[PDB]
Design an enzyme around this catalytic site. Structure first.
Site, PDB file in Angstrom:
ATOM      1  N   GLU A 194      -3.660   5.916  -2.049  1.00 57.11           N
ATOM      2  CA  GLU A 194      -2.117   6.236  -1.329  1.00 57.11           C
ATOM      3  C   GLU A 194      -2.399   7.794  -1.794  1.00 57.11           C
ATOM      4  O   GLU A 194      -2.015   8.322  -0.580  1.00 57.11           O
ATOM      5  CB  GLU A 194      -0.687   5.620  -0.358  1.00 57.11           C
ATOM      6  CG  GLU A 194      -0.785   6.301   0.107  1.00 57.11           C
ATOM      7  CD  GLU A 194       0.873   7.131  -0.303  1.00 57.11           C
ATOM      8  OE1 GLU A 194       0.952   7.211  -1.685  1.00 57.11           O
ATOM      9  OE2 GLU A 194       0.956   7.643   0.930  1.00 57.11           O
ATOM     10  N   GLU A 195      -1.762   7.950  -2.776  1.00 54.48           N
ATOM     11  CA  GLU A 195      -1.914   9.773  -3.092  1.00 54.48           C
ATOM     12  C   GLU A 195      -2.958  10.620  -2.809  1.00 54.48           C
ATOM     13  O   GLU A 195      -3.114  11.312  -2.838  1.00 54.48           O
ATOM     14  CB  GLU A 195      -1.287   9.464  -4.496  1.00 54.48           C
ATOM     15  CG  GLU A 195      -0.642   8.902  -5.291  1.00 54.48           C
ATOM     16  CD  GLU A 195       1.466   9.936  -4.131  1.00 54.48           C
ATOM     17  OE1 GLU A 195       0.969  10.303  -3.435  1.00 54.48           O
ATOM     18  OE2 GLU A 195       2.059   8.495  -4.560  1.00 54.48           O
ATOM     19  N   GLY A 213       1.191  11.396   6.062  1.00 53.65           N
ATOM     20  CA  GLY A 213       1.692  11.229   4.827  1.00 53.65           C
ATOM     21  C   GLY A 213       2.393  10.202   4.489  1.00 53.65           C
ATOM     22  O   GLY A 213       2.743  10.130   3.611  1.00 53.65           O
ATOM     23  N   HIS A 252       6.538  13.715  -8.272  1.00 50.18           N
ATOM     24  CA  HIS A 252       5.364  13.323  -8.599  1.00 50.18           C
ATOM     25  C   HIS A 252       4.733  14.455 -10.122  1.00 50.18           C
ATOM     26  O   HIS A 252       4.161  15.477 -10.064  1.00 50.18           O
ATOM     27  CB  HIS A 252       4.392  14.467  -8.029  1.00 50.18           C
ATOM     28  CG  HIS A 252       3.272  13.544  -6.195  1.00 50.18           C
ATOM     29  ND1 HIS A 252       2.845  14.223  -6.077  1.00 50.18           N
ATOM     30  CD2 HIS A 252       4.346  12.583  -6.048  1.00 50.18           C
ATOM     31  CE1 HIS A 252       2.457  13.377  -4.777  1.00 50.18           C
ATOM     32  NE2 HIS A 252       3.281  12.186  -4.644  1.00 50.18           N
ATOM     33  N   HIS A 292      -2.970   8.972  19.771  1.00 51.37           N
ATOM     34  CA  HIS A 292      -1.495   8.415  20.390  1.00 51.37           C
ATOM     35  C   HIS A 292      -1.023   9.384  21.214  1.00 51.37           C
ATOM     36  O   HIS A 292      -1.166  10.413  20.029  1.00 51.37           O
ATOM     37  CB  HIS A 292       0.092   8.195  19.116  1.00 51.37           C
ATOM     38  CG  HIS A 292       0.599   7.408  19.859  1.00 51.37           C
ATOM     39  ND1 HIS A 292       1.492   7.238  20.314  1.00 51.37           N
ATOM     40  CD2 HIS A 292       1.165   6.067  19.862  1.00 51.37           C
ATOM     41  CE1 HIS A 292       2.524   6.410  21.057  1.00 51.37           C
ATOM     42  NE2 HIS A 292       2.315   5.485  20.652  1.00 51.37           N
ATOM     43  N   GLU A 347      -9.961  -0.069   9.124  1.00 52.53           N
ATOM     44  CA  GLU A 347     -11.471   0.599   9.650  1.00 52.53           C
ATOM     45  C   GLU A 347     -12.105  -1.295   9.246  1.00 52.53           C
ATOM     46  O   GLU A 347     -12.454  -1.540  10.354  1.00 52.53           O
ATOM     47  CB  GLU A 347     -11.792   0.991   8.502  1.00 52.53           C
ATOM     48  CG  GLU A 347     -11.393   2.669   9.510  1.00 52.53           C
ATOM     49  CD  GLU A 347     -12.117   4.361   8.467  1.00 52.53           C
ATOM     50  OE1 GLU A 347     -12.537   5.347   9.051  1.00 52.53           O
ATOM     51  OE2 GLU A 347     -12.512   3.566   7.332  1.00 52.53           O
ATOM     52  N   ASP A 374       8.224   6.588  -6.342  1.00 53.04           N
ATOM     53  CA  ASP A 374       6.822   7.374  -5.480  1.00 53.04           C
ATOM     54  C   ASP A 374       6.494   6.661  -6.344  1.00 53.04           C
ATOM     55  O   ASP A 374       4.740   7.393  -6.966  1.00 53.04           O
ATOM     56  CB  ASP A 374       6.961   8.087  -5.676  1.00 53.04           C
ATOM     57  CG  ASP A 374       5.924   8.903  -4.258  1.00 53.04           C
ATOM     58  OD1 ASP A 374       5.058   7.570  -4.077  1.00 53.04           O
ATOM     59  OD2 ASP A 374       4.929   9.825  -4.254  1.00 53.04           O
ATOM     60  N   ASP A 391       3.139 -10.242  24.869  1.00 55.23           N
ATOM     61  CA  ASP A 391       2.260  -9.751  24.909  1.00 55.23           C
ATOM     62  C   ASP A 391       2.231  -8.466  25.038  1.00 55.23           C
ATOM     63  O   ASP A 391       1.852  -7.467  25.272  1.00 55.23           O
ATOM     64  CB  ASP A 391       1.189 -10.294  24.747  1.00 55.23           C
ATOM     65  CG  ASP A 391       0.412 -11.580  24.914  1.00 55.23           C
ATOM     66  OD1 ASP A 391       0.704 -11.431  22.958  1.00 55.23           O
ATOM     67  OD2 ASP A 391      -0.586 -12.516  24.540  1.00 55.23           O
ATOM     68  N   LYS A 427       1.999  17.777   7.708  1.00 46.94           N
ATOM     69  CA  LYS A 427       0.483  16.412   7.980  1.00 46.94           C
ATOM     70  C   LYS A 427       2.167  15.189   8.172  1.00 46.94           C
ATOM     71  O   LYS A 427       2.027  14.402   8.873  1.00 46.94           O
ATOM     72  CB  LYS A 427       0.444  16.112   7.400  1.00 46.94           C
ATOM     73  CG  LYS A 427      -0.625  14.693   7.358  1.00 46.94           C
ATOM     74  CD  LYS A 427      -1.548  14.319   6.643  1.00 46.94           C
ATOM     75  CE  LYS A 427      -1.982  13.352   6.304  1.00 46.94           C
ATOM     76  NZ  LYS A 427      -3.163  13.278   5.530  1.00 46.94           N
ATOM     77  N   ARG A 464       0.764  20.429   1.216  1.00 47.99           N
ATOM     78  CA  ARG A 464       0.359  21.469   1.000  1.00 47.99           C
ATOM     79  C   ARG A 464      -0.709  21.200   0.803  1.00 47.99           C
ATOM     80  O   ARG A 464      -0.980  22.351   1.115  1.00 47.99           O
ATOM     81  CB  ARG A 464       0.803  20.656  -1.115  1.00 47.99           C
ATOM     82  CG  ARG A 464      -0.580  19.396  -1.199  1.00 47.99           C
ATOM     83  CD  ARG A 464      -0.078  19.321  -3.045  1.00 47.99           C
ATOM     84  NE  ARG A 464       1.125  18.187  -2.658  1.00 47.99           N
ATOM     85  CZ  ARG A 464       1.299  16.742  -2.951  1.00 47.99           C
ATOM     86  NH1 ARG A 464      -0.084  16.541  -1.705  1.00 47.99           N
ATOM     87  NH2 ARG A 464       2.311  16.979  -2.360  1.00 47.99           N
ATOM     88  N   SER A 493       2.287  23.385  37.067  1.00 42.02           N
ATOM     89  CA  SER A 493       3.231  22.332  37.057  1.00 42.02           C
ATOM     90  C   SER A 493       3.289  21.149  36.219  1.00 42.02           C
ATOM     91  O   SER A 493       2.204  19.880  36.205  1.00 42.02           O
ATOM     92  CB  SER A 493       2.787  21.689  38.141  1.00 42.02           C
ATOM     93  OG  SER A 493       4.594  20.722  38.575  1.00 42.02           O
TER      94      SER A 493
HETATM   95  N1  LIG Z   1       7.892  11.629   0.441  1.00 38.98           N
HETATM   96  C1  LIG Z   1       5.910  12.045   1.644  1.00 38.98           C
HETATM   97  C2  LIG Z   1       5.796  11.355   1.292  1.00 38.98           C
HETATM   98  C3  LIG Z   1       5.039   9.978   0.279  1.00 38.98           C
HETATM   99  P1  LIG Z   1       3.672  10.501  -0.461  1.00 38.98           P
HETATM  100  O1  LIG Z   1       3.097   9.179  -1.554  1.00 38.98           O
HETATM  101  O2  LIG Z   1       3.794  11.566  -1.892  1.00 38.98           O
HETATM  102  C4  LIG Z   1       2.060  10.253   0.203  1.00 38.98           C
HETATM  103  C5  LIG Z   1       1.443  11.825  -0.839  1.00 38.98           C
HETATM  104  C6  LIG Z   1      -0.306  11.883   0.493  1.00 38.98           C
HETATM  105  C7  LIG Z   1      -0.611  12.335   1.615  1.00 38.98           C
HETATM  106  C8  LIG Z   1      -1.972  11.917   2.962  1.00 38.98           C
HETATM  107  O3  LIG Z   1      -2.356  12.145   2.061  1.00 38.98           O
HETATM  108  O4  LIG Z   1      -1.228  11.840   3.091  1.00 38.98           O
HETATM  109  C9  LIG Z   1       1.421  12.879  -0.730  1.00 38.98           C
HETATM  110  O5  LIG Z   1       2.553  13.333   0.124  1.00 38.98           O
HETATM  111  O6  LIG Z   1       1.243  13.532  -1.863  1.00 38.98           O
HETATM  112  C10 LIG Z   1       6.672  10.243   2.708  1.00 38.98           C
HETATM  113  O7  LIG Z   1       7.680   9.293   2.289  1.00 38.98           O
HETATM  114  O8  LIG Z   1       6.237   9.841   3.164  1.00 38.98           O
HETATM  115 CA   LIG Z   2     -13.874   5.022   5.707  1.00 46.62          CA
HETATM  116 ZN   LIG Z   3       4.196   7.476  -2.452  1.00 47.76          ZN
HETATM  117 ZN   LIG Z   4       3.512  10.330  -4.106  1.00 46.36          ZN
END
Ligand SMILES: N[C@@H](CCP(=O)(O)C[C@@H](CCC(=O)O)C(=O)O)C(=O)O
Ligand SMILES: [Ca+2]
Ligand SMILES: [Zn+2]
Ligand SMILES: [Zn+2]
Ligand SMILES: *[C@@H]1O[C@H](CO)[C@@H](O[C@@H]2O[C@H](CO)[C@@H](O[C@@H]3O[C@H](CO)[C@@H](O)[C@H](O[C@H]4O[C@H](CO)[C@@H](O)[C@H](O)[C@@H]4O)[C@@H]3O)[C@H](O)[C@H]2NC(C)=O)[C@H](O)[C@H]1NC(C)=O
Ligand SMILES: *[C@@H]1O[C@H](CO)[C@@H](O[C@@H]2O[C@H](CO)[C@@H](O[C@@H]3O[C@H](CO)[C@@H](O)[C@H](O[C@H]4O[C@H](CO)[C@@H](O)[C@H](O)[C@@H]4O)[C@@H]3O)[C@H](O)[C@H]2NC(C)=O)[C@H](O)[C@H]1NC(C)=O
Ligand SMILES: *[C@@H]1O[C@H](CO)[C@@H](O[C@@H]2O[C@H](CO)[C@@H](O)[C@H](O)[C@H]2NC(C)=O)[C@H](O)[C@H]1NC(C)=O
Ligand SMILES: *[C@@H]1O[C@H](CO)[C@@H](O[C@@H]2O[C@H](CO)[C@@H](O)[C@H](O)[C@H]2NC(C)=O)[C@H](O)[C@H]1NC(C)=O
Ligand SMILES: *[C@@H]1O[C@H](CO)[C@@H](O[C@@H]2O[C@H](CO)[C@@H](O)[C@H](O)[C@H]2NC(C)=O)[C@H](O)[C@H]1NC(C)=O
Ligand SMILES: *[C@@H]1O[C@H](CO)[C@@H](O[C@@H]2O[C@H](CO)[C@@H](O)[C@H](O)[C@H]2NC(C)=O)[C@H](O)[C@H]1NC(C)=O
Ligand SMILES: *[C@@H]1O[C@H](CO)[C@@H](O[C@@H]2O[C@H](CO)[C@@H](O)[C@H](O)[C@H]2NC(C)=O)[C@H](O)[C@H]1NC(C)=O
Ligand SMILES: *[C@@H]1O[C@H](CO)[C@@H](O[C@@H]2O[C@H](CO)[C@@H](O)[C@H](O)[C@H]2NC(C)=O)[C@H](O)[C@H]1NC(C)=O
Ligand SMILES: N[C@@H](CCP(=O)(O)C[C@@H](CCC(=O)O)C(=O)O)C(=O)O
Ligand SMILES: *[C@@H]1O[C@H](CO)[C@@H](O)[C@H](O)[C@H]1NC(C)=O
Ligand SMILES: *[C@@H]1O[C@H](CO)[C@@H](O)[C@H](O)[C@H]1NC(C)=O
Ligand SMILES: *[C@@H]1O[C@H](CO)[C@@H](O)[C@H](O)[C@H]1NC(C)=O
Ligand SMILES: *[C@@H]1O[C@H](CO)[C@@H](O)[C@H](O)[C@H]1NC(C)=O
Ligand SMILES: *[C@@H]1O[C@H](CO)[C@@H](O)[C@H](O)[C@H]1NC(C)=O
Ligand SMILES: *[C@@H]1O[C@H](CO)[C@@H](O)[C@H](O)[C@H]1NC(C)=O
Ligand SMILES: [Ca+2]
Ligand SMILES: [Cl-]
Ligand SMILES: [Cl-]
Ligand SMILES: [Zn+2]
Ligand SMILES: [Zn+2]
EC number: 3.4.17.21
Lengths: 694, 694
Positions: free
Chosen positions: A370-371, A464, A499, A633, A382, A333, A610, A643, A156, A574
């Site tokens: 995480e959300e 994500g 959600h 990466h 970090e 979730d 290693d 994302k 989103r 190339s």
């Molecule tokens: N289906 C996805 C989402 C799981 P999620 O916990 O819902 C992650 C959350 C935040 C992600 C972000 O901010 O980067 C989101 O997508 O809104 C999965 O399995 O990996």
């Molecule tokens: Ca920080």
């Molecule tokens: Zn999740």
């Molecule tokens: Zn979620």
């Protein structure tokens, strides 16, 4: 004996069921007291289960919440400024929860405040190609319009970024039944479909791996210097709000202007799906008005970090992590994953009480926030980046264990392909019709590899989820596995109740996994992966699998470029250096594999361990990708358009994307060439880490 | 036996003398055939001496050379455009070399082309404080003027950068006898002083650690993408040319306008040292005109890389490196160092032929294009950064072994302080009056520590030599040692014949070190350091020495801030986090030292060796310092006013520098606070690498 079988057999479906119930009776929104209390409960239980140490690691990060006394809603407003229709202020609660407190109403986290009024434009999924179609083909201009977009297909936050750059003054997200109501299944509570009143919460940031918006690069600890809100990372500049399809129907039904360009723009509602701008003649003076009053607030969050010290290599870390915070009850979730982690800790702890220790250190994490943008995992990484950089073997994620009941879904680095194939051959399938067959057999049959016969599909890692800092920023070998649905084109869209307040313990127990056999199967895959990584004498990585995919990706990016043969001639573009590097990597990795098999010497072993551990590390570029300093990466990055999706050779991919539209082709192709050089160099440099060391 | 004594005793003054003679008969300018031929000779000899492998690593980098058929010079031009005085086109060659070919005439490498004419302003050493004095106190405006500056005190590139930002349209550098002619000593060839016709060559880039101007971040290999010259790193925007003091006298003698502000602006020439602008009344219509025609050209360079594989830890590298390219004959710089390296390789090779191998791998390097901005070492480190990052134990530099004959001069990381003290106590002093006394004893007596009784001075590392990429970019523990003069305030100025055609084998043999005893002493210090690093079971680093200096640096930076108490009150500027971090580091390092002493277990040993090796690594910030992405060490960086000088807590230092002059004090102090946070965080993070690992 204390071997993988002992570990796996200790895992119980019944225990996973008990923990899921326990974690899902009240909401656990990040930064609330209920989620802090659950943190403390987990910390206690992990200690009881036998871990050596269990600590809370807290940070103060930017979170976002609706105003309890000034609710968010959208209206249709007439000529005179009368609000003639208002969207809902909350989702109707499910049976037996209609008295539960502290259910956060649907909102888009990090939306700015505002009350924009204007004419609607319908933008399908608000993908890059949807906006191309609108602006380039249909000549519709979104500037100063309120855009309405259906959820699905991409993250989103990408939709909001695309809306903002089209000049939108607001965004309305909604769940179309086409994407969120499976044919022939009943709405919750009588089936697993999304009711018309249901709404998908979720953040709309574009952080590109930064973590807390206010402290990019450094942990948000007690003395942290914070950016001012105006310099914060990733915040949207226009108000945004999500709604259900009953409300969406009311907003869409009056839409006029142009017809949908084709059928891929039409959802399942009984409306025309006209693009706009604005409403049909009779309603042409009616507008849409948003009312958004949410506030961003620095708030304390809490990760639980459990340590099981290794017997032989305590300074090598294998990490099993997944989040604890949910939007509401989190029945899928993340609690279907958190319950699995809890049972894995319990099983490892049972062995430890009997005197066993793994070879390497295992770290277990219950991440917070995480959300709200992978905040907890990111801040912790970090803070500990030097330790992780030099000691991190692997990271196994553990978000939702199920999003369906059809087959396994695995995304991981090529380094883990062999480990996954081998482990899944040793595990029993839970699938009906595959009794007495291996998980490998059911998975390969249901999810065949597009490239290889008798092999399963394994997908790339983007972002994500909480592996992102470990894999994309720090270059630690990462993997994830869960059970999933059949619904191919719904891959990035979410299961229907995603959600929403309807995502409950009952949803899972009644409709997804009544016997908790799919949960158990995922606990076996995640736990077995951790077991092998933490205990195998030689790390269970096969560098030759990276060589095979690098060639596939080099063929792919070359094929994209070769859509522009005249330009490749003109600018002397190339790919020879890149193919040379991939050839070299293939040859060196082959020789290293021979030595790994041909080599009693613990120094040569660890030297070789290693080389295996630092191989993923070698694909990191310390300068990062263009304008995305935290995606470092060179082989994988989260798609710049989505994302959730991993992209291969992202620097070259983005340099090539839509290049025919660039005003200075000389400059644009010079950049493609620069990216080819960076890619060829990094592949060769990674190859050289596998050469004999002296 | 095969121990350090065996190694040290094999080293011979006579051999160092023979190699110095051999390396200094013709010029070895980077990118010329003579320097490629010397590369091949060294490669051959190192193989013969017994190294396991010896390869050339080549790159194509931006170099700069005068136009052979269109010479550089400066004139005084009269009213009518007649050039009434011209500076010299070459230095008079010394006795017996007046027929040597391919002596590059004096020039400033990387100067742009131009023929600017204008009025002179004399700017003393063209330091930051010299320009402050001119612009702020004397109200003299350099805009559109040709600036003339004496060499000395700071790196010449800093002078040019300061001139450019003062708005100068050209810069003339000269050697004043005050800085380059020691009282009571004769001019070359009859002593070691600089003749009036002598001139100091040298590059005037401001690369800030980038390496080749065209390829920052990546090796300049065959397929490298190069920046266009207009996007190149570090090139000066105004013409620049160096001259001797006979020529300088002619340019300075007519100068008018303002008198020198004080005596620290007056050199030793019989002139007023008036600041200008322009000449006194009678000559007021005469101008100065530069003629610069040098060209920048991408040119191949060659490093020699020799490997002596370790017996036990082949994947741990101890590196001894120094450059091979010279401006002309390089009798001191670098061949007095290169000859020492050659004799060290020979001695290690003698042990190897008798069956010995060091514990860890030793890499020996003869770097190219050092004189043109540390290009060879930097490109090699860019190519091999992953290997160095994960395997690099230490880097010992080996440029000029002598710049005087008075005492030892050592600059290194605190991690090596104990190693140096211990080694120097075991070595004999070469000094007259200290016969039968240790090197430690003569050094401490002649160069006392300002902070501690009975301890020698050891200085910080900045840049201006080949350790810079290893230490400042990659965070590998680095050191250097040489013999030096008494001349305190001449520390950064060079010995008198620096970078002149007079710097010959005869200079050294007659005036510096006729017996090659100082060379031998330096071979013992450099070789002994390499020996201990490559062979000690526990790495010879003492983390407690870092704790002591971190406190001294934190006191120092706090004391700078505390010149502004009102601002610290207003903006709530606290150093408490930094002192807390230093206290923590001191406590943790103490405990780690206890374990290192208290710990037959090779895993615990190497775990501990890895904690010691990665400690310097932990002071690296992957985001780099502000606008200097290749200076990533948080405790040390090259001074932003003088590349030769190391600065401590550079991010906070630069945030504080001249802060009373900033237009937005709120913003400026916010940045000081940000830098305190970064410093406190990095010190704590480094501390935590020394904690128990699990
Ligand atoms: N289906 C996805 C989402 C799981 P999620 O916990 O819902 C992650 C959350 C935040 C992600 C972000 O901010 O980067 C989101 O997508 O809104 C999965 O399995 O990996
Ligand atoms: Ca920080
Ligand atoms: Zn999740
Ligand atoms: Zn979620
Ligand atoms: C994959 O691995 C191989 C090693 O097996 C590696 O091959 C190397 O390729 C480089 C670049 O092509 C070779 O570089 C050449 O080196 C020689 C000296 O050894 C030079 O004389 C060459 O320069 C001349 O020719 C150039 C090409 O026409 C001209 O542009 C130039 O002006 C000179 O005239 C050139 O630099 C190198 O020798 C091999 N090394 C080997 C075979 O051991 C290859 O580079 C690897 N792939 C990647 C992407 O790294
Ligand atoms: C040096 O090492 C020590 C460890 O010996 C380390 O001490 C830690 O300091 C932090 C930051 O001060 C402490 O953080 C506190 O943690 C408690 C929970 O443990 C919180 O409740 C505290 O927050 C409250 O109080 C704050 C201060 O008034 C308020 O701003 C806040 O709103 C809360 O009311 C606070 O976060 C931490 O507990 C100790 N850890 C110990 C003693 O083990 C120190 O940080 C290290 N130095 C550096 C620079 O890292
Ligand atoms: C989830 O399970 C936990 C642990 O069993 C329960 O918390 C315990 O509950 C008892 C009864 O109140 C207390 O005496 C203990 O101190 C708690 N133990 C902890 C926190 O470790 C909790 O009640 C369960 N929650 C739900 C909703 O069932
Ligand atoms: C939509 O909600 C709005 C806001 O509550 C309603 O408009 C308000 O109605 C009250 C009572 O009539 C007035 O006193 C306020 O001045 C109105 N506020 C506005 C316009 O923001 C509106 O009635 C609701 N519409 C529907 C169809 O229920
Ligand atoms: C997956 O299992 C296969 C089959 O056992 C492993 O490949 C074998 O490894 C053994 C042990 O070194 C070799 O001797 C065999 O020759 C291999 N057989 C092959 C390649 O078919 C493989 O190592 C496992 N992968 C892991 C553990 O990552
Ligand atoms: C520096 O020493 C080297 C090595 O002794 C000399 O190069 C050798 O000279 C002989 C006689 O020409 C040749 O046959 C060898 O092939 C050379 N060996 C090499 C390059 O390894 C060189 O002559 C000396 N240079 C000076 C100026 O004395
Ligand atoms: C300084 O050098 C310049 C350049 O060579 C001399 O000026 C040139 O003199 C020749 C011969 O008289 C003329 O043909 C050129 O036209 C002059 N070129 C110029 C002005 O650039 C000048 O004579 C020299 N001055 C001194 C004092 O020796
Ligand atoms: C420098 O030498 C000193 C004196 O020998 C070393 O310090 C001793 O180390 C031994 C061996 O572990 C300890 O048992 C002694 O207690 C130490 N004596 C002290 C601290 O006075 C020191 O380790 C050497 N430094 C190096 C090798 O980096
Ligand atoms: N005395 C100095 C200089 C030795 P150097 O070899 O002469 C280095 C050379 C280039 C330095 C640069 O570009 O950064 C220079 O300073 O002009 C020392 O010993 O370290
Ligand atoms: C919530 O509602 C109203 C709107 O201004 C007010 O009383 C209060 O300031 C708001 N709380 C916020 C903005 O956090
Ligand atoms: C879109 O509409 C706005 C309306 O003012 C205008 O500024 C913008 O240039 C338009 N773009 C195009 C290409 O139509
Ligand atoms: C579980 O599997 C059955 C059998 O195919 C299916 O009918 C049902 O829809 C599945 N449940 C979910 C939530 O997908
Ligand atoms: C050197 O001298 C002259 C000046 O233009 C000319 O013949 C030649 O182009 C020059 N060489 C260069 C610029 O490299
Ligand atoms: C310095 O001189 C130039 C001459 O045009 C002018 O542009 C500049 O502003 C002057 N600066 C000061 C502060 O005198
Ligand atoms: C060498 O030392 C002697 C004795 O002090 C001194 O007179 C001479 O100047 C020194 N040589 C150099 C080059 O410093
Ligand atoms: Ca480069
Ligand atoms: Cl997951
Ligand atoms: Cl040196
Ligand atoms: Zn030098
Ligand atoms: Zn030099």
């Amino acid at each position: 004996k204390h071997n993988m079988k002992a570990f796996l057999d200790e895992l119980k479906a019944e225990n996973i069921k008990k923990f899921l119930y326990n974690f899902t009776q009240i909401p656990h929104l990040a930064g609330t007291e209920q989620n802090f209390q659950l943190a403390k409960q987990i910390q206690s239980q992990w200690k009881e289960f036998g871990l050596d140490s269990v600590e809370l690691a807290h940070y103060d990060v930017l979170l976002s919440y609706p105003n309890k006394t000034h609710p968010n809603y959208i209206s249709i407003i007439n000529e005179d400024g009368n609000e003639i229709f208002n969207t809902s202020l909350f989702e109707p609660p499910p049976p037996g929860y209609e008295n539960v407190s502290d259910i956060v109403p649907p909102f888009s986290a990090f939306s700015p405040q505002g009350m924009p009024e204007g004419d609607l434009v319908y933008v399908n999924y608000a993908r890059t190609e949807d906006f191309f179609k609108l602006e380039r083909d249909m000549k519709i201009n979104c500037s100063g319009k309120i855009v309405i977009a259906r959820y699905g297909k991409v993250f989103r936050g990408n939709k909001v970024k695309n809306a903002q750059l089209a000049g939108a003054k607001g965004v309305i997200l909604y769940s179309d039944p086409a994407d969120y109501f499976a044919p022939g299944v009943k709405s919750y509570p009588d089936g697993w479909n999304l009711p018309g009143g249901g709404v998908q919460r979720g953040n709309i940031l574009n952080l590109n791996g930064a973590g807390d918006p206010l402290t990019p690069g450094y942990p948000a600890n007690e003395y942290a210097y914070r950016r001012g809100i105006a310099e914060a990372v990733g915040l949207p500049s226009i108000p945004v709000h999500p709604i259900g399809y009953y409300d969406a129907q009311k907003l869409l039904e009056k839409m006029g202007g142009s017809a949908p360009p084709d059928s891929s723009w039409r959802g399942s509602l009984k409306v025309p799906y006209n693009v706009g701008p604005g409403f049909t003649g009779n309603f042409s003076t009616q507008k849409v008005k948003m009312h958004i009053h949410s506030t961003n607030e620095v708030t304390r969050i809490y990760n639980v970090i459990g340590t099981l010290r290794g017997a032989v290599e305590p300074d090598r870390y294998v990490i099993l992590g997944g989040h604890r915070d949910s939007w509401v009850f989190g029945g899928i979730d993340p609690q279907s994953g958190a319950a699995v982690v809890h049972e894995i800790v319990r099983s490892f702890g049972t062995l430890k009480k009997e005197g066993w220790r793994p070879r390497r250190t295992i770290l277990f994490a219950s991440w917070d926030a995480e959300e709200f943008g992978l905040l907890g995992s990111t801040e912790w990484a970090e803070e500990n980046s030097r330790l992780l950089q030099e000691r991190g073997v692997a990271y196994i994620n553990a978000d939702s264990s199920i999003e369906g009941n059809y087959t396994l879904r695995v995304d991981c680095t090529p380094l883990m392909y062999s480990l996954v194939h081998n482990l899944t051959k040793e595990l029993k399938s839970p699938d009906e019709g595959f009794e007495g067959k291996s998980l490998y057999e059911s998975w390969t049959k249901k999810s065949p590899s597009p490239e290889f016969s008798g092999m399963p599909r394994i997908s790339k890692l983007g972002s994500g989820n909480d592996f992102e800092v470990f894999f994309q920023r720090l270059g630690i070998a990462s993997g994830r596995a869960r059970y999933t649905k059949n619904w191919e084109t719904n891959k990035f869209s979410g299961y229907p109740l995603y959600h929403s307040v309807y995502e409950t313990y009952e949803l899972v127990e009644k409709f997804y996994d009544p016997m908790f056999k799919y949960h158990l199967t995922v606990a076996q895959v995640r736990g077995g992966m951790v077991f092998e990584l933490a205990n195998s004498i030689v790390l269970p990585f096969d560098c030759r699998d990276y060589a095979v995919v690098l060639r596939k990706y080099a063929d792919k990016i070359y094929s994209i470029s070769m859509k522009h043969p005249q330009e490749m001639k003109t600018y002397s573009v190339s790919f020879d250096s890149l193919f040379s590097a991939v050839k070299n990597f293939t040859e060196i990795a082959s020789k290293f594999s021979e030595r790994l098999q041909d080599f009693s010497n613990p120094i040569v072993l660890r030297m070789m361990n290693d080389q295996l551990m630092f191989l993923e590390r070698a694909f990191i570029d310390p300068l990062g990708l263009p304008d995305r300093p935290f995606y470092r990466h060179v082989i994988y990055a989260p798609s710049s358009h989505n994302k959730y999706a991993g992209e291969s050779f992202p620097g070259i991919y983005d340099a090539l994307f839509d290049i025919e539209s660039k005003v200075d082709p000389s400059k644009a192709w010079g950049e493609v060439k620069r990216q080819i050089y960076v890619a060829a160099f990094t592949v060769q440099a990674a190859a050289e880490t596998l050469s004999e060391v002296a």
